Design an enzyme around this catalytic site. Structure first.
Site, short mmCIF file in Angstrom:
data_model
loop_
_atom_site.label_atom_id
_atom_site.label_comp_id
_atom_site.label_asym_id
_atom_site.label_seq_id
_atom_site.Cartn_x
_atom_site.Cartn_y
_atom_site.Cartn_z
N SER A 215 -52.50 -22.94 33.14
CA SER A 215 -52.28 -22.20 31.83
C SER A 215 -51.87 -20.91 31.49
O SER A 215 -52.20 -19.91 32.74
CB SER A 215 -54.11 -22.07 31.91
OG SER A 215 -53.99 -22.00 30.77
N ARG A 216 -51.23 -20.14 31.10
CA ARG A 216 -50.54 -18.85 30.62
C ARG A 216 -51.17 -18.02 29.80
O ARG A 216 -50.50 -16.78 29.67
CB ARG A 216 -49.04 -19.18 29.56
CG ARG A 216 -48.21 -20.10 30.45
CD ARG A 216 -46.98 -19.93 30.18
NE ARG A 216 -46.30 -20.77 29.29
CZ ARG A 216 -45.67 -22.05 29.90
NH1 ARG A 216 -45.82 -22.50 30.54
NH2 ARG A 216 -45.24 -22.95 28.52
N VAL A 217 -52.01 -18.21 29.80
CA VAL A 217 -53.21 -17.14 29.53
C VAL A 217 -53.80 -17.12 30.84
O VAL A 217 -53.70 -15.35 30.99
CB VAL A 217 -54.27 -17.30 28.55
CG1 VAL A 217 -53.75 -17.62 27.17
CG2 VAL A 217 -55.05 -18.94 28.98
N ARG B 56 -42.48 -18.25 20.94
CA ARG B 56 -43.08 -19.33 20.44
C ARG B 56 -44.04 -17.75 19.56
O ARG B 56 -44.01 -16.32 20.20
CB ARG B 56 -44.08 -18.93 21.90
CG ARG B 56 -44.02 -20.83 22.42
CD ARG B 56 -44.44 -20.38 24.47
NE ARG B 56 -44.57 -21.69 24.76
CZ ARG B 56 -43.46 -21.61 25.60
NH1 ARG B 56 -42.86 -20.18 25.87
NH2 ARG B 56 -43.23 -22.66 26.84
N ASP C 156 -49.11 -24.17 25.58
CA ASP C 156 -49.13 -22.65 26.46
C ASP C 156 -49.71 -23.75 27.92
O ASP C 156 -50.47 -22.72 29.04
CB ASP C 156 -50.29 -21.22 25.57
CG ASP C 156 -49.72 -21.25 25.01
OD1 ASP C 156 -48.49 -21.31 23.72
OD2 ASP C 156 -50.55 -20.53 23.68
#
Ligand code: ATP
Ligand code: ADP
Ligand code: MG
Lengths: 502, 467, 187, 128
Positions: D117-119, B181, D92
């Site tokens: 959520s990957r943030v 990514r 994401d």
């Protein structure tokens, strides 16, 4: 429609008559290399399955003799082949060198040594596409093939000429059983009687090359290489080489089988051959089947495992055992290939993985493991002992689902026996020590030992008998059966040793 | 030699040479673009035409453009100046720092080491991490496999392995980002710049990143792990040193291969994967081995699709793995970092013939005590601590102490915990655990060991916090 | 394989392959013009009722057809190239599409000598002085050497003006398209 | 346009599992080789080269942005189908919606167990 030899580069040669200059009865030009197959134009005098040789030093065999252009599978990497390259016949059905000039060598699937110790100076070349012995040449399986493993020799006996099957999930102890069986023949291969010497062959198919290198090193560490061949079509090698490796090994073994000697071939493992064959097929557009395996992924194994026969005295009395290895998936022994091979062999050795986690190594699962033919071929001492060991374990397996002292006694017996059946690695024990320990176990003398302590008892016991009582073991081996006087001895020795072990 | 394009079907181009064809796998430059478009041959279709798979977007190609044959497979720069740089599959830097000035070039398609080269002795790679070097030892030239998802400290573990290998064994590293990514690619770049494995100022970087983005056409996500392998083969061969090689992820390698195989028209295999799945994986996992010049270890992240451990991709990968490192979330709640699970982490070399009897007995004892404690956990949770005798409470205390002692403070993770990075050598780990099992420290408070290096520092911490 | 000289135009399919082979083989030996003459001859020779009837029945053994073609090609005394091509087509079984081959070859030779196709579709009947000016102006599009082969066509279906094709280049100044364009623009 | 003009945008595709079907038709009719579930080999490149334009430019390229909220329909919670996994391995995060929760009365029917959520901590205000 269209044609495949109807290309401009060919129609031009034919239009202006230039083909009179280039030979086509004995030489072709690669029309198109792709998907690991070469459509080759010419070779009018090529026999089906001949072994043609490209112009880059490669080698392939002709599968499809289509009316206009041969189809050739390249035993190597087609990176080296280019449309327009010149392919030359060799006038010999695809064959491989054989003899005793291979012993101790590592050879790739075609007989080209890959250990850098010089050429295989052999004289005889045997086909790979041979037929298996018919109905009449064979006779029953009589001699035993001492595995050197307690479980295999006691409960899953293996004859000579019997196709066994080491089947079980990955990382379970299959290669280990094969190496034990290959190292345990050192004792027999240091005599004179040709009736005992067993020459081993190890085919490593689709198996990491580092692993094969370590295996060869481990074998030579025990001088178990002076009498072994190691055919190696590892993971990197193009699929056609992984496809031929089993047939090359089986031919190098048939050479012995046909000359009154006894061989032992270990395919490690046929599942990866089957995968390589499925690749080869699906790249030739052939129809898929069940799991995408071609229709004939059974006439791929059968024509290979049917050569592991037991000739009779008329033809030489030779032999060729076989121990194909199979890596079932998680637990499925009903998949396509495990089932396709369970119905070709004369036995099975199920290496359960739960047992392997629980520290019972070898993990040989009994009950699911049979040797339909090995019972007729088993040293009568080991029969005198196994006849009861199998019975005791069979009783134990019923009472393992749950007490009065009867079931407690049976549980104690079963636990003691299984604790005996464990074993180290690369430490195979002659049959006399097996009968000694299994006898001292089955006859109850270990009922009065804490389970965990058997794992030690055995060890010590071996030493105490390997030195003090050479004579008794010699008598057992030479007579092959526990003579009543020998039983009395074994009894008194075990009692005396047990007295002061603690 | 200059051929001409004759077809552009999606991302599969077909070029018609006349004078002389390029052997399969040669890289061709498409003339007339502004971005460097590179095709890679994959077949010969007869009539002096070759079917090439394109390594970049093929919109704007015109039947008849000129395609110039380079001569050798995709070639990349492989000097030591490829350290601390980012470069896409074809070797073109994408860090906006300029050309990768190197004097060497290497083709990404080189055959695996011959059988004579292979080294026959299975060593152990000392990573400097207690849990890894104790329960799941990493083997030199072995294909480790790093399970576990995000949020559990995977990037931190990667950076720590890089740093520890660069210090202990004095060997560089690589990072082949198969299908990486773009957002996470940038985040990893900046994480490394922070932690200091990459260094923009002095040319003392320990990583050579390689990114095949998730949007680059499929033909250029299969050949990125090969780019990483070549950059690392230079260090193994031309400089004789140990190397790491992180392939995040190794399921997207098979995915890219499957897409390319489908494009070339080949019949799909068992589950839609390419017919050449096993050999495609083999001809790339077979260069990751220990020759006599050096070695290439490899820590490959694995995605198991639908938790199918029978699926052909994770079933073809596991035939090569020589280890495992199951990062788990449940062990991150306790704060034990790294989250490496001790009871799932396997390793093929955890055998007393290789590591040694002392190592094996210690590791097996730790595993057994941890299993027993996990079992007693259920009894305690259900009934209560009362239900247990002291013959069990002692094992519980030892197990809690061991679970603590497995946690280690990483150097790169100084930003989080402040503690100093401890590169505990193998012997110190073995002694510490062999002693904690021998009851020698059953009195120190558990927090004596939590986040320490050797056992001696645990003693010192007990003394400090006990006053 | 042996290097071969590509045609000027590319034709595709069976006829494409055969015509390309013949053209490349003829360019060597420089027998292009006489090859085209012989191709035209075989055109008719393969339209006589007996020949065109025996070369469609599939129950005439292939060797029989090949030998009959050989015998006929002795009487007509063709060049070795053309006789070999007729043979080739005969035993590959692809003679049923011989007219496709020669036709393609003609298109392969026309462009070789440089006679670009053209066409002028007119609103209605056209004068011949207008055709003179038309040719003299279209010659302004060619390269240095080419020739114009204009095939006029009357068309009242269009409204006015004309449609001119030259090779591929297509210029449409017919009032009909102007009307639909205007209606589109102002709708 | 907004993103590279120093503005902040937000784009909601609804669905993407119908763009994928339209592309499958386009391909199967052009006769391109099919694959799993009949989708071509590009049905990953298709989406990936789309959902990778959603960026957050730095302050030298303007400071713009472009969120993306691809809507995906899964056939009875079959998150393992081809397109759901193709588009779950590109993005994401995921906001999983379920119909057991929608009828228990938990509307919006978000399923916080599966949604991630990957943030994470970032992308929130210190208060929240
Ligand atoms: N009898 C045994 N006692 C102790 N350990 C064993 C025994 N047999 C095998 N092992 C151990 O099991 C591990 C894997 O064994 P093995 O090499 O047989 O794998 P395998 O069953 O061949 O599967 P693969 O094909 O993946 O190797 C090795 O580390 C080996 O040391
Ligand atoms: N040794 C450690 N000590 C303390 N915290 C750690 C340690 N290793 C990882 N973590 C925590 O785990 C998180 C890992 O995040 P990051 O490495 O960026 O991606 P991932 O979560 O995929 O590994 C970090 O935010 C950090 O707080
Ligand atoms: Mg094995």
């Amino acid at each position: 429609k269209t044609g495949t030899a109807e290309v401009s580069s060919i129609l031009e040669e034919r239009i202006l008559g230039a083909d009179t200059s280039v030979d086509l009865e004995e030489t072709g030009r690669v029309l198109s290399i792709g998907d690991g197959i070469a459509r080759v134009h010419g070779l009018r005098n090529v026999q089906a399955e001949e072994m043609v040789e490209f112009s880059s030093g490669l080698k392939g065999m002709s599968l499809n003799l289509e009316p206009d252009n041969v189809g050739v599978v390249v035993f190597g990497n087609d990176k080296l082949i280019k449309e327009g390259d010149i392919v030359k016949r060799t006038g010999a059905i695809v064959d491989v060198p054989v003899g005793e000039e291979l012993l101790g060598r590592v050879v790739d699937a075609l007989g080209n040594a890959i250990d850098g110790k010089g050429p295989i100076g052999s004289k005889a070349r045997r086909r790979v596409g041979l037929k298996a012995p018919g109905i009449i040449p064979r006779i029953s399986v009589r001699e035993p093939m001492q595995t050197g493993i307690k479980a295999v020799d006691s409960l899953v006996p293996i004859g000579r000429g019997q196709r066994e099957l080491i089947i079980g999930d990955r990382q379970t102890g299959k290669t280990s059983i094969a190496i034990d069986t290959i190292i345990n023949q050192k004792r027999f291969n240091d005599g004179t009687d040709e009736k005992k010497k067993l020459y081993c062959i190890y085919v490593a198919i689709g198996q990491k090359r580092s692993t094969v290198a370590q295996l060869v090193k481990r074998l030579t560490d025990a001088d178990a290489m002076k009498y072994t061949i190691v055919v190696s079509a590892t993971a990197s090698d193009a699929a056609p080489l992984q496809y031929l490796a089993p047939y090359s090994g089986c031919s190098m073994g048939e050479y012995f089988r046909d000359n009154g000697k006894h061989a032992l071939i270990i395919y490690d493992d046929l599942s990866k051959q089957a995968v390589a064959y499925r690749q080869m097929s699906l790249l030739l557009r052939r129809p898929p089947g069940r799991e995408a395996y071609p229709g004939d992924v059974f006439y791929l194994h059968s024509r290979l495992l049917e050569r592991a026969a037991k000739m009779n005295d008329a033809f030489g009395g030779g032999s060729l055992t076989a121990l194909p290895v199979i890596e079932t998936q998680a637990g499925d022994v009903s998949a396509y290939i495990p089932t396709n091979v369970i119905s070709i062999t004369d036995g099975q050795i199920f290496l359960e993985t739960e047992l392997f986690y629980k520290g019972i190594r070898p993990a040989i699962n009994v009950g699911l493991s049979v040797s339909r033919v090995g019972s007729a071929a088993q040293t009568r001492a080991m029969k005198q002992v196994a006849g009861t060991m199998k019975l005791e374990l069979a009783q134990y397996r019923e009472v393992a689902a749950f007490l009065d002292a009867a079931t407690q006694q049976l549980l104690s017996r079963g636990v003691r026996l299984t604790e005996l059946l464990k074993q180290g690695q690369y430490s195979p024990m002659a049959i006399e020590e097996q009968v000694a320990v299994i006898y001292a176990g089955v006859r109850g003398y270990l009922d009065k030992l804490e389970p965990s302590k058997i794992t030690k008892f055995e060890n010590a016991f071996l030493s105490h008998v390997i030195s003090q009582h050479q004579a008794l073991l010699g008598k057992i081996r030479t007579d092959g059966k526990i003579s009543e006087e020998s039983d009395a001895k074994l009894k008194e020795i075990v009692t005396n040793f047990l007295a002061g072990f603690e | 030699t200059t051929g001409r394009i004759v077809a552009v079907i999606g991302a599969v181009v077909d070029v018609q040479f006349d004078e002389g064809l390029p052997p399969i796998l040669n890289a061709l430059e498409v003339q007339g673009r502004e971005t460097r478009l590179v095709l890679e041959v994959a077949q010969h279709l007869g009539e002096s035409t070759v079917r090439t798979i394109a390594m970049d977007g093929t919109e704007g190609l015109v039947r008849g453009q000129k395609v110039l044959d380079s001569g050798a497979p995709i070639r990349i720069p492989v000097g030591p100046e490829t350290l601390g740089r980012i470069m896409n599959v074809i070797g073109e830097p994408i860090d906006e720092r300029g050309p990768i000035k190197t004097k060497q070039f290497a083709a990404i398609h080189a055959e695996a080491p011959e059988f004579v080269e292979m080294s026959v002795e299975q060593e152990i790679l000392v990573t400097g991490i207690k849990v890894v070097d104790l329960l799941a030892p990493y083997a030199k030239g072995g294909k480790i496999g790093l399970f576990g998802g995000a949020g559990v400290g995977k990037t931190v573990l990667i950076m720590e392995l890089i740093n520890n290998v660069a210090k202990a064994h004095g060997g560089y590293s690589v990072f082949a980002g198969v299908g990486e990514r773009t957002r996470e690619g940038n985040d990893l770049y900046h994480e490394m710049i922070e932690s200091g494995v990459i260094n923009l100022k002095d040319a003392t970087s320990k990583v050579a990143l390689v990114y095949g983005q998730m949007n680059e056409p499929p033909g250029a996500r299969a050949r990125v792990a090969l780019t990483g392998l070549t950059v690392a083969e230079y260090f193994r061969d031309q400089e004789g040193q140990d190397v790491l090689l992180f392939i995040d992820n190794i399921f997207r390698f098979t995915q890219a291969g499957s897409e390319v195989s489908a494009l070339l028209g080949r019949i799909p295999s068992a589950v839609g994967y390419q017919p050449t799945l096993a050999t495609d994986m083999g001809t790339m996992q077979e260069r990751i081995t220990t020759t006599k010049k050096g070695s290439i270890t490899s820590v490959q992240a694995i995605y198991v699709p639908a938790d199918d451990l029978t699926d052909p991709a994770p079933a073809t990968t596991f035939a090569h793995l020589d280890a495992t490192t199951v990062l788990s979330r449940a062990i991150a709640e306790l704060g034990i970092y790294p989250a490496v699970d001790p009871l799932d982490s396997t390793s093929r070399i955890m055998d007393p013939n290789i590591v040694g009897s002392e190592h094996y007995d210690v590791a097996r004892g730790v595993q057994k005590i941890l299993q027993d404690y996990k079992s007693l956990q259920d009894i305690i949770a259900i009934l209560g601590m009362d239900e247990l005798s002291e013959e069990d409470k002692l094992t519980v205390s030892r197990a809690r102490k061991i679970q603590r002692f497995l946690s280690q403070p990483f150097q790169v993770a100084e930003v989080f915990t402040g503690h100093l990075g401890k590169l505990v050598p193998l012997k110190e780990t073995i002694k510490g655990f062999q002693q904690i099992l021998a009851g020698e420290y059953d009195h120190l408070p558990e927090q004596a060991f939590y986040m320490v290096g050797p056992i001696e520092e645990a003693v010192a911490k007990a003394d400090k916090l006990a006053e | 394989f042996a290097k071969l000289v590509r045609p000027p135009v590319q034709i595709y399919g069976i006829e494409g392959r055969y015509a390309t082979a013949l053209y490349s083989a003829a360019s060597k030996q420089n027998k292009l013009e006489q090859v085209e003459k012989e191709l035209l001859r075989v055109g008719q020779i393969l339209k006589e009722p007996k020949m065109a009837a025996s070369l469609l029945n599939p129950y005439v053994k292939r060797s029989v057809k090949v030998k009959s073609l050989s015998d006929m090609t002795a009487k007509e005394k063709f060049s070795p190239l053309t006789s070999n091509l007729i043979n080739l087509l005969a035993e590959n079984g692809r003679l049923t599409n011989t007219p496709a081959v020669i036709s393609a070859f003609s298109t392969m030779m026309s462009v070789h000598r440089g006679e670009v196709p053209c066409t002028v579709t007119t609103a209605s009947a056209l004068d011949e002085a207008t055709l003179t000016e038309l040719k003299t102006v279209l010659k302004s599009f060619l390269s240095k050497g080419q020739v114009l082969k204009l095939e006029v066509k009357i068309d009242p279906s269009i409204m006015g003006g004309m449609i001119v094709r030259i090779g591929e280049k297509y210029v449409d100044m017919s009032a009909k398209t102007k009307i639909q364009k205007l209606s589109r623009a102002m709708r």
